[PDB]
């Protein structure tokens, strides 16, 4: 899968205006939604060479597990997650498993284009059937996880618009990565060059239609790269 996208943002106060605008522009009011994502990385205690059976270089990457959480269980899975039996309300739940590549290279790209390998986990059984054990069985460990809540809009040609808020989850507390406003995302998922240039056009027309009001641009490739690497001191 190829995901073509553009991003933007607005502060909390810009909410109502944006919702009103997207509702008129798309013809439908927003739809509430959420998702919990847990990111996993190769176990650092284990170490393997980074090469094929064909002796070809393989880059270590993170695996992303995602699914929706009923809103009624939201506090339970975030704040009150620990003390297992301290709550308000067998096998693993279904999950979406994804590994993505750093977006396609190119100066003056009209949109971001990212390849995404995904498979679906439906269930489990056996000794260690928890999704956590299963990830460990693959040689991975839990790294971090975040909750995203927002509204989406279905538009023409498969264009989708998400207005989102993101919270990282830890016992020490959830911190809002998007504190201040909403992360705006417009995208289309593409399973032929044509449909790719057509999809770019759809995104470009949406960008054009919001120019002046809210700007949508291509984020930095490096900001969309989940590959594992070091312990680098930033700047």
């Amino acid at each position: 899968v190829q995901q073509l996208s553009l991003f933007g943002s607005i502060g909390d106060d810009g909410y109502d205006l944006l919702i009103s605008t997207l509702t008129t522009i798309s013809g439908n009011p927003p739809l509430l939604y959420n998702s919990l994502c847990t990111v996993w990385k190769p176990n650092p205690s284990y170490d393997v060479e980074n090469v094929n059976s064909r002796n070809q270089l393989v880059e270590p990457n993170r695996i992303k597990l995602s699914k929706e959480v009923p809103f009624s269980y939201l506090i339970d899975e975030t704040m009150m997650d620990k003390p297992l039996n301290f709550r308000i309300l067998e096998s693993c739940s279904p999950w979406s498993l994804q590994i993505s590549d750093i977006p396609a290279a190119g100066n003056n790209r009209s949109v971001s284009m990212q390849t995404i390998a995904e498979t679906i986990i439906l269930s489990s059984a056996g000794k260690n059937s928890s999704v956590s054990s299963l990830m460990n069985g693959l040689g991975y460990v839990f790294e971090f996880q975040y909750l995203t809540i927002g509204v989406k809009f279905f538009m023409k040609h498969g264009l989708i618009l998400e207005l989102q808020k993101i919270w990282q989850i830890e016992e020490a507390g959830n911190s809002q990565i998007t504190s201040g406003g909403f992360l705006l995302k417009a995208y289309i998922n593409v399973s032929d060059i044509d449909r790719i240039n057509y999809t770019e056009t759809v995104l470009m027309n949406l960008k054009k239609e919001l120019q002046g009001y809210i700007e949508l641009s291509v984020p930095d490739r490096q900001s969309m790269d989940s590959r594992v690497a070091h312990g680098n001191i930033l700047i």
Partner: peptide, 22 residues
Amino acid sequence: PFNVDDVLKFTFTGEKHHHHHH
């Protein structure tokens, strides 16, 4: 409000910045 790139970078790698970069 915040830096789009930084927010995205977090969702893809988990890093939060206590300092301003670039």
